[PDB]
Amino acid sequence: VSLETPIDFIPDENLPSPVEAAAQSLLSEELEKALSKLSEREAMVLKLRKGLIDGREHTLEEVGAYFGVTRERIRQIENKALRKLKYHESRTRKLRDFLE
Amino acid sequence: ERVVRDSLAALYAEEDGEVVKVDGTRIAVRYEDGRLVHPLRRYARSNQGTAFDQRPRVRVGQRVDLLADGPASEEGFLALGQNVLVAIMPFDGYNFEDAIVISEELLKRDFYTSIHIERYEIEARDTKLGPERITRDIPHLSEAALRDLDEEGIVRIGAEVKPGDILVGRTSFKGEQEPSPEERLLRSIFGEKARDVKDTSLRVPPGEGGIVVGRLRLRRGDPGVELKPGVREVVRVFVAQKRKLQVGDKLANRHGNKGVVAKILPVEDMPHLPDGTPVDVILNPLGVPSRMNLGQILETHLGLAGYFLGQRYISPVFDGATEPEIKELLAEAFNLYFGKRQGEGFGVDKREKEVLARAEKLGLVSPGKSPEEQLKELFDLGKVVLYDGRTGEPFEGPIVVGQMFIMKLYHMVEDKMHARSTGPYSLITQQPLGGKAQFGGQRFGEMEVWALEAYGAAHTLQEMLTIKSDDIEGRNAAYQAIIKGEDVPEPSVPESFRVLVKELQALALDVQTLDEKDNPVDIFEGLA
Amino acid sequence: SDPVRQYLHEIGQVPLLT
Amino acid sequence: QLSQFKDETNPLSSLRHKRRISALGPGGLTRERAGFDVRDVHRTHYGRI
Amino acid sequence: AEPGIDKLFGMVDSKYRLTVVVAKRAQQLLRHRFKNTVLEPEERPKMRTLEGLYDDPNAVTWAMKELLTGRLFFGENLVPEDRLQKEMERLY
Amino acid sequence: KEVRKVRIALASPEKIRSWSYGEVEKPETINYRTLKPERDGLFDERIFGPIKDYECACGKYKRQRFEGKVCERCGVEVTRSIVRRYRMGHIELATPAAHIWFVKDVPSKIGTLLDLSATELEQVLYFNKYIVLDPKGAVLDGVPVEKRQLLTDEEDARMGAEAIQELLKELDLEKLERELLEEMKHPSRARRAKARKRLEVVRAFLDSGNRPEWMILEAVPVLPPDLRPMVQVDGGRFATSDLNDLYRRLINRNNRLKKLLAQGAPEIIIRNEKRMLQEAVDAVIDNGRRGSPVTNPGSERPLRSLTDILSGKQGRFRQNLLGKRVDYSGRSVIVVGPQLKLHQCGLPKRMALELFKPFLLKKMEEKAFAPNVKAARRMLERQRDIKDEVWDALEEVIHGKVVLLNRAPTLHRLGIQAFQPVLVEGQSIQLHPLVCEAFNADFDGDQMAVHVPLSSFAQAEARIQMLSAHNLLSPASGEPLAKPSRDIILGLYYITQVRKEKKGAGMAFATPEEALAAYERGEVALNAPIVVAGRETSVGRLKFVFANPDEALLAVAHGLLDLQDVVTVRYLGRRLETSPGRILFARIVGEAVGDEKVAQELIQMDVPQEKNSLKDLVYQAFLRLGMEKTARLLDALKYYGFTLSTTSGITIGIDDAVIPEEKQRYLEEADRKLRQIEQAYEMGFLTDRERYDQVIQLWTETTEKVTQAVFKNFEENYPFNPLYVMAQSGARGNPQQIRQLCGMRGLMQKPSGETFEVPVRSSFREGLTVLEYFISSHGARKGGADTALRTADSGYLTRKLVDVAHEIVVREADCGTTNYISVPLFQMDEVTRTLRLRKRSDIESGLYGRVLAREVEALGRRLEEGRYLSLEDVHFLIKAAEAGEVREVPVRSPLTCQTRYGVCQKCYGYDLSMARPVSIGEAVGVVAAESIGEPGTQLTMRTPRVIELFEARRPKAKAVISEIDGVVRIEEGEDRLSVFVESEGFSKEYKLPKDARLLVKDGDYVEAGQPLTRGAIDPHQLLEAKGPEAVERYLVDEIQKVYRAQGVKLHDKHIEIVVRQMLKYVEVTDPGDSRLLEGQVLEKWDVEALNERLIAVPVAWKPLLMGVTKSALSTKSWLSAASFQNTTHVLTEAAIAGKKDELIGLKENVILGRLIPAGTGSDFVRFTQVVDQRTLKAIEEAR
DNA sequence: GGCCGCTTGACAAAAGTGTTAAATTGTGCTATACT
DNA sequence: AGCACAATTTAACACTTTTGTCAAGCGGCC
Ligand SMILES: [Mg+2]
Ligand SMILES: [Zn+2]
Ligand SMILES: [Zn+2]
């Protein structure tokens, strides 16, 4: 179990990464901005669906009761988001947030 | 004569001869006793990142008893550095204090070049939660830069790679960070899905522009490898790289005169000798000549002398080779040098005549016969007039020129430089240290802070402990600010101080942030 | 010189049993 | 300590180790910079060897 | 050195009080509102690179020149430090 | 709110359960068969036991949680400790313990009555009898007396260390008495020392709570840290940490004791099983006395327990204060080249892309380049080699934005500075030559920490003060620095060394004879006089002060004027004789600044040469320039300063140093004197010893003669030819360095101490006899081990200097102090009773811009009191000193001011740098260290005297002196050659041994009594029999002698401001209302207890004397101190009592995180400066 | 009349409760040898 | 050097059920 700390012995660290935290809010702000071209009946849908509002990973079932309409079309907006949003990525560099 | 064999740098020759060498990478045998092939070290490997080679020197048959040189040697003769024509003189200031001047001539012929190797090692841990394995389909890393020079995992041998590339892309099921809230969107938006292995690879270190010589897979299942328990697949690759010669580095011959390459002016300029051969290296005094006096110039005078006369004199310590010994040698060298000129179709130059008017009164050369002799004695203890390829007129004054010895120390510049930003980090220590991509580092000596505060610098001083380093929760403020907008940095929030208060809190000691009001007793540490 | 001696002097000062 | 990384920078470097010789190590003649009184212990000596 | 730096010391009673004014101004000279500079005519500090003539992104230099036009003011004045936002408010 | 003061001291055991609350117990297992992290005991995440399914209740809101198994939205995944503090409890409840109690008899012995055995009971090995029932043997008692068996002889009773906790209230109720009945012990001498220490320790408990909770009953370590995960890389694996294992020997021991005690456990078994628990306490605190290695019984590395690591020596206190870790900088090699002389720098063109990446990204966002900031982070990583457009936008960012270049190691204020990054090519970082003289290092691959300030409030705070074109011209010490360093001097020296080539001495009838005839042969343009002038009549350079001398520089360019100063008549402003060479110099500095009018009356002509005077030209120019123009000079002397030497060249040939043709026979006479002293032995004359030193002196003199002959041979003939002198005179050469080469220097001394017999046959040109080098090496050994030994002790002494003077800052405005100091204009010489001119070099830098204590009348105008006597007034007083009007120039030194927390306003005459009075904010406390922060490397530690007086340590032989001024009294005998001193009163007996026993007479105040030739008796006796009169001055005079021996530029009050710190502490005698008769109150602070109370009580004192290291252990604060070699007693005394840290202190702010009380953050510079005219006009009505 | 949108039904995939199988402690205690 | 018994305890895995998602059908609107 190592000689504890022979001869501040060994550095190594990667938990409260500074850049990760700076880019954490950044990647978040980028989304807050990347969601400006979205509609409530789509953005919020993704918010509650992909657990974003806070942490609740509610599904289409819980997102359909409060959103008047039911499943499908609220699901056809989910896909609409994957496309209408993706169509705004191939022309706008932003695929550099995965490696984080 | 023994430093080449005793050090076993090179090889040897047993009994008779008759080599019939095939050369290449495996010296043949000798008709002495049996048939034994002498395999070269094949560039081998160094412990200082140098890698020595051993080129042969024979064919058909020969014996006496050298046989193939070694690292830095030539015909059983120890050759560490490299000797080149130099000239003592100041030039615009590209040799102040004790710096050194270099020409482009050396680079054109790659005169000064070396080799540096470095061994890598990527072990595939087995944290049980998720074993690691080397694959060529790293998640999210789906690109050409991979499949092109990676494949099957390890990089192909003989593939030139630069810094910021993959070498041993190992996959680990180690799931430390589950999917993030708003991150699940950018993951579904695109055509890709999620992940469960992460990139996690080797990634070339901050400096490596060469090629691979060969790899080596050392995984378990082999009882012939004493490895760390629980470890599997210990990739080990060797990356090479040519050194060439940029700017800087230490020359320092064999006397003490050490310096650094300032600027390498391409041919054009530099003192042009009255027959071509532009001064390759300029060694201006200052530093050790007058102060820590030495005897290196005694090589220059006998350098060009051995150049023209075509010889490499041997000067044993405390024996032979004295001032008068240079006289006899200089005589032959002169008549041979001026000989060509005088017979080439000319003799004595105007610009080479005014220089004598200097020594004349200067008491250097004795007045008497034509410039012929004045240029002779000026060669015995000095050199020819010499000119300047940049300006246009010759350097008014007797300048010395000759071949001495210009070595090169291990300490260079490339692997002796560093640069970073907020990228570095060393959790628990609360300071920039470590990194799987950049091993940056920088210390602020104690004798440095006092000087910084000596000035009116109070915000710059504090800054060194405000955002950067200390305040981890503050490191973002600045870097996050500038990137977004102007704004002035935070008031400062020390990180180590919180650790100091804690470490010092291990005991009764209660580091209270007593406010100026006294009775309130301020305290900043409640997770804000 | 260890503190074990202090106890070694207190443990080897009282007789055992007949 | 003594078992320093064989400086294989060059032939002359590896040979200077077997003759390098020192006074620092398991003995009490170590301690760099200071060490009671070693000022007149590292100075020259009447040994042309 | 700085174009007319010595002239900056003469005014301020201290070399340290000068620096503060230099930045204190730069804080509300480029970041607050780039349109708060007294030097607007032909005295407007500008750069001349390969492209053309533009205003240097650095405002610390403007202060040294801005605190030489005879204008501005320094020292203990206006206790309300929250009033600076009011004056800056009118400047959008 | 805002951070301010700080509190500490002990904390009752109940308070320990406050910060920690609970969450502890269980073994210290760091893992399990599975799940390496959790262990539900050691570093268990507070309320985290696999699936506690709770704890999240305490949290109000913020986010969800409770995920049953695995883990919820707790800290384990995020916010785990967050590097914050997290106390445990360690439970504990055994007998007792001990918080180390330091090693200065604290928390015990002082508050009690037992020493050298107080541990015998505190370690459970005795019995602190604390009961009264009438004994038998020898009456009862109340302390330790029952050493085993005794306590059982009667069979209260306490044999364990638990009694320490019992003496809590027992000493609390008696505390009031321990401060009364204890102090009741008046003088009587001897014991009056303990009552002082006992009262100081009990004075703490006398107020502000603080109970004797020293008897720990439950420790509380830390868990968040120590826990390093797997670390592969290179060729290794595995990992861990300390603080855990070394801690396991505490909890487990406490538990096992709870298992033994609960069951059947006889006394003996518990007494030893308990003492190990407290041993574990000290083990977790500091490993000493015995130690605790690993892998027992095998010896290996000592376990790290705070000692030397964390809260102790260099480990977490020396590295966090200053030597932290900058998160914005880099390193590289060094280079030199005509950049622009200041205002610019080198800095790579590749790495700079990272240092200035932030703002550079935002710039591209609007410059079309990058679409967003994020994308700008993925275009420069894979080394795609951009080199396109980006290099341009980078310029806008690097426009007027300076960078801080540092040098390692650091020395004095001239160790940082700042320039403007001018990306060149390659990677090598180059700088201006001159700047090197400030770092002291030869270009040979050295590096320079390139720091970079972010905040804009740091940029202006830098380039305005740290710019090399400001804080480098006139440094501290005393003399300038920006002056043209080496090389440059030789570039102007090679044209002013006379052209006299010896032509003879002819004559012409006004230039009509030897003008054309001599032009053919003999007599050129040297001597020869005609009418009045000489050969000057040849090329009359006309022109005028219109556009420089045309005919002059014009003729030189062609094949006419040989230049290099060949004597020529110009027109400039008058018919002179100056050659076109010097004309160039005056022309370079002319167009540089403005009109030769200034340089004309400044630059000399009688003795040009451009020798070691270039430091006086630029220096004198400052008075009529002021940076803006001054900088231009160092720039003009640059271009030409190197070009002139370039388009000329001067090599050092082996013959360049022509051997003295008139030297050979000199050694003959010297050797012909050998037999002279040799044959004296065969005749039996002159002892073998007398012969020894007899021959030594012989060669010691001839060497100077030979050197003179050489220096002479190199003066007359062979002028510019010999370069060995061109640098020796004034450029970059040493005089004694010449006598080595062409000389013969061989007067080397044996390794131990005895100049060899026959010298060395130097004459390098001729190889030594193989013996000469081996003989000369013996001396060439100390010349390297001494300089390198300047990091052993001397290097660890400068810290003491920076620690002392720390809170010294120039503030306020006009304090008003009567008493003044009178600097001596003439000093005495021990050799002969006669004052000297002090060589002037001491008076100058000693009065350079000061504060005339009073009006100074001396031929002509008077030097008004409080007048800043610049360099001019200095020379005026020195030259007028020879007259006989002034002997002691009145002045005000930092030693006279009732302010220990702050320096003084206008008292520290001139800020020795900007050639003007000091500015409010100049932390002279640190500058004082910058002064002494240089000679260190230039010393001789191999003996050490400068530190001797500092710590006030009694010097060698003590140098006994006359404590009183009596009379002659000089009696001699056999071995009692002692001398006494008395007068109509008492006579003291000075057992003067056998040495410097001079006569002298008529009493003597202190002097030396005769034996004390140098290093008078430790200041302790001085101040003891004199006072703060000679103490504060004796240092400024003696201490400098060690500096004057090497000719130091520093002096003035730089060393006179650090003395006030060692002499600002006073003692107590019959105080007023204030407790502690002994005490150790400071100066000013004590004056306050006698200032406000004066309007009522007498509070007399005595000027105490403390060393340099003692002025740290006991200070007004605590954050300082420690460091040195006592980071154990400090925190002790510092604790216990209130000892509230001050507020005004550089460190206090840097450490805590506050802003600097000095610099631009001073209390004198925190007002407003924003008012764009209309702003003030608007608010005028808006109010 | 056709197209689009919304709602419901069916299918597929992943949890709470149950069920059982594998490990630690104590103690027992064993056990053997020496006094 | 250690095995067992018991006892009891700890750990995990699998089931049947439930929940979520997708496709199809129906209704309404254009
Ligand atoms: Mg160096
Ligand atoms: Zn839970
Ligand atoms: Zn004062």
| Residue whose CA lies closest to nucleotide H24 C1' | A72
Say which amino acid occupies F376.
Answer: A
In chain B, which among 403-442 make CB contacts under 8 A with chain E?
none
Question: Which nucleotides of strand G lie within 7 A of protein CB?
Answer: 5-8, 16, 23-24
- Measured CA to CA in angstroms, residue F259 lies from B147, F263, F357, F1076 at distances of 64, 6, 63, 49
Distance of CA B403 to the CA centre of its chain: 24
Question: What number of H helices and E strands is found in chain C?
Answer: 1, 0
Domain containing F231 equals 1-325
Residue F149 (CA) to nucleotide G32 (C1'), in angstroms, measures 39
Q: Locate tokens 């020969």: which residue?
A: B62
Cα separation of A68 and F39, whole Å? 49
The answer on F934 and F785 residing in a single domain is: no
| Nearest chain F residue to C4, by CA | F272
Cα separation of D31 and D23, whole Å? 10
Residue that is last in its domain, among F746, F769, F791: F791
Q: Do B425 and A85 touch (CB under 8 A)?
A: no
Question: Nearest nucleotide to A58 by CA–C1' distance?
Answer: H20
Q: From ligand 3's centre to the CA of F563, what distance in Å? A: 57
Question: What number of H helices and E strands is found in chain F?
Answer: 39, 14
Q: Mapping DSSP to helix (H, G, I), strand (E, B) and coil, where does residue F901 land?
A: coil
Closest by CA position to F322, among listed B447, B499, B467, B442: B447
Question: Is the Cβ–Cβ distance between B386 and B271 less than 8 Å?
Answer: yes
Residue F310 (CA) to nucleotide G33 (C1'), in angstroms, measures 53
Tell me the pairing of strands B238-239 and B118-119: antiparallel
Q: Is F1095 on the interface with B (CB under 8 A)?
A: no
Distance of CA B126 to the CA centre of its chain: 38
**What is the three-state SS of B418-450?**
EECCCCCCCCCCCCCCCCCCCCCCCCCCHHHHH
Beta strands (DSSP E) in F935-1006 are 979-981, 988-990
The answer on F411 and F296 residing in a single domain is: no
Residue B178 (CA) to nucleotide G23 (C1'), in angstroms, measures 32
Domain presence at residue F1007: no
Q: From ligand 2's centre to the CA of F66, what distance in Å? A: 4
Q: Is B455 on the interface with E (CB under 8 A)?
A: no
Distance of CA F153 to the CA centre of its chain: 63
Binding residues of F are 56, 58, 71, 74, 442, 444, 446, 815, 897, 904, 907
Of F148, F268, F276, the CB nearest to C3: F276
Residue A46 (CA) to nucleotide G13 (C1'), in angstroms, measures 21
Q: Using a CB-CB distance cutoff of 8 angstroms, which residues of chain B are in contact with residue F1140? A: 514
Closest by CA position to F567, among listed F501, F622, F518: F501
Residue B221 (CA) to nucleotide H1 (C1'), in angstroms, measures 33
Domain presence at residue F148: yes
The answer on F421 and F402 residing in a single domain is: yes
Beta strands (DSSP E) in B339-478 are 401-403, 418-419
User: What's the total number of domains in chain F?
Assistant: 5
The answer on F502 and F462 residing in a single domain is: no
The answer on F397 and F274 residing in a single domain is: no
Q: Please give the domain boundaries of chain E with CATH numbers for all domains.
A: 1-92 (3.90.940.10)
Domain presence at residue F1072: no
Chain A nearest CA to F231, separation (Å): 7
Tell me the pairing of strands F418-419 and F821-824: unpaired
Cα separation of F1090 and B397, whole Å? 78
DSSP state of F1161: G
Cα separation of F337 and F432, whole Å? 7
Residue A61 (CA) to nucleotide H19 (C1'), in angstroms, measures 9
Residue that is last in its domain, among F297, F325, F353: F325
DSSP state of E71: -
Residues with CB under 7 A from strand G: A 68-70, 72-73; F 33, 68
Q: Is A18 on the interface with B (CB under 8 A)?
A: yes
Way it was determined: X-ray
DSSP string, F86-110: -B------SS------TTTTTTTTS
Closest by CA position to F334, among listed B18, E67, B261, A14: B261
What is the number of the ligand closest to the CA of F810?
Answer: 3
Burial pattern B61-86, b for ≥16 Cβ within 10 A else e, equals ebbeebbbbbbbbeebebebbebbbb
Q: Do E31 and B456 touch (CB under 8 A)?
A: no
Cα separation of F79 and F76, whole Å? 7
Cα separation of F583 and F560, whole Å? 16
The answer on F236 and F199 residing in a single domain is: yes
Question: Nearest nucleotide to A60 by CA–C1' distance?
Answer: H20
Closest by CA position to F901, among listed F1109, F1087, F1116, F1058: F1116
List of residues 6+ apart from F362 with CB closer than 8 A: B482, B483, F373
In chain E, which among 17-36 make CB contacts under 8 A with chain B?
19, 27, 30-31
Q: From ligand 2's centre to the CA of F55, what distance in Å? A: 9
Q: Using a CB-CB distance cutoff of 8 angstroms, which residues of chain B are in contact with residue A50? A: 181-182, 184-185, 188
In chain C, which among 1-18 make CB contacts under 8 A with chain F?
1-4, 6-7, 10-11, 14
Of B7, B48, B410, the CB nearest to D11: B7
Question: Which nucleotides of strand H lie within 7 A of protein CB?
Answer: 11-12, 19-22
Q: Do D33 and F781 touch (CB under 8 A)?
A: no
Peptide bond into F1019 cis (omega under 30): no
| Nearest chain B residue to F79, by CA | B527
The answer on F900 and F841 residing in a single domain is: yes
List the structure tokens of B380.
């015995």
Residues with CB under 7 A from strand H: A 49, 59-62, 75; F 34, 50
List of residues 6+ apart from B349 with CB closer than 8 A: B274, B385
Domain presence at residue F181: yes
Residue F826, exposed/middle/buried by CB under 10 A (0-12, 13-18, 19+)? middle
Residue of F80, F286, F322, F424 to mutate, testing the B interface (most B Cβ within 10 Å of its Cβ): F322
Domain presence at residue F879: yes
List the structure tokens of F966.
């009596």
Chain B nearest CA to F234, separation (Å): 6
Cα separation of F991 and E32, whole Å? 80
Cα separation of F710 and F738, whole Å? 9
List the structure tokens of F187.
């003088």
Q: Using a CB-CB distance cutoff of 8 angstroms, which residues of chain A are in contact with residue F45? A: none
| Nearest chain F residue to A92, by CA | F371
The answer on F579 and F490 residing in a single domain is: yes
List the structure tokens of E16.
């340290």
The separation between the first and the last C-alpha atoms of chain E, rounded to the nearest angstrom, is 35
In chain E, which among 46-75 make CB contacts under 8 A with chain B?
none
Q: Do E5 and F359 touch (CB under 8 A)?
A: no
Domain presence at residue F1034: no
Chain F nearest CA to A70, separation (Å): 26
The answer on F806 and F763 residing in a single domain is: no
Cα separation of E75 and E11, whole Å? 12
Domain presence at residue F431: yes
The separation between the first and the last C-alpha atoms of chain B, rounded to the nearest angstrom, is 74
Q: Using a CB-CB distance cutoff of 8 angstroms, which residues of chain C are in contact with residue F276? A: 3
Q: Using a CB-CB distance cutoff of 8 angstroms, which residues of chain F are in contact with residue E63? A: 460
Question: Is the Cβ–Cβ distance between F206 and F175 less than 8 Å?
Answer: yes
Residue B32, exposed/middle/buried by CB under 10 A (0-12, 13-18, 19+)? middle
The answer on F332 and F320 residing in a single domain is: no
Question: Is the Cβ–Cβ distance between F1080 and F1067 less than 8 Å?
Answer: yes
Question: Is the Cβ–Cβ distance between A34 and A85 less than 8 Å?
Answer: yes
The answer on F452 and F491 residing in a single domain is: no
Cα separation of F585 and F636, whole Å? 10
Q: Is A40 on the interface with B (CB under 8 A)?
A: no
Of E3, E20, E77, the CB nearest to F1165: E20
- Could you give phi then psi for residue F1103, rounded to 5 degrees? -60, 95
This PDB structure is determined at a resolution in Å of: 6.5
Cα separation of A27 and A29, whole Å? 6
Tell me the pairing of strands F329-331 and F450-451: antiparallel
The separation between the first and the last C-alpha atoms of chain F, rounded to the nearest angstrom, is 28
Cα separation of B460 and F467, whole Å? 14
Residue that is last in its domain, among F470, F489, F521: F470
| Nearest chain B residue to D6, by CA | B47
The answer on F747 and F632 residing in a single domain is: no
List the structure tokens of F634.
């160092």
Question: Is the Cβ–Cβ distance between B45 and B238 less than 8 Å?
Answer: yes
Say which amino acid occupies B70.
Answer: G
Binding residues of F for Mg(2+) are 442, 444, 446
List the structure tokens of B164.
């910021």
Q: Do E19 and B486 touch (CB under 8 A)?
A: no
The separation between the first and the last C-alpha atoms of chain A, rounded to the nearest angstrom, is 31
Domain presence at residue F900: yes
Q: From ligand 2's centre to the CA of F86, what distance in Å? A: 21
Residue F281 (CA) to nucleotide H9 (C1'), in angstroms, measures 36
Binding residues of F for Zn(2+) are 56, 58, 71, 74, 815, 897, 904, 907
Burial pattern F699-736, b for ≥16 Cβ within 10 A else e, equals beebbeebbeebbebbeeeebbbbbbbbbbbbbbbeee
Cα separation of B508 and F214, whole Å? 9
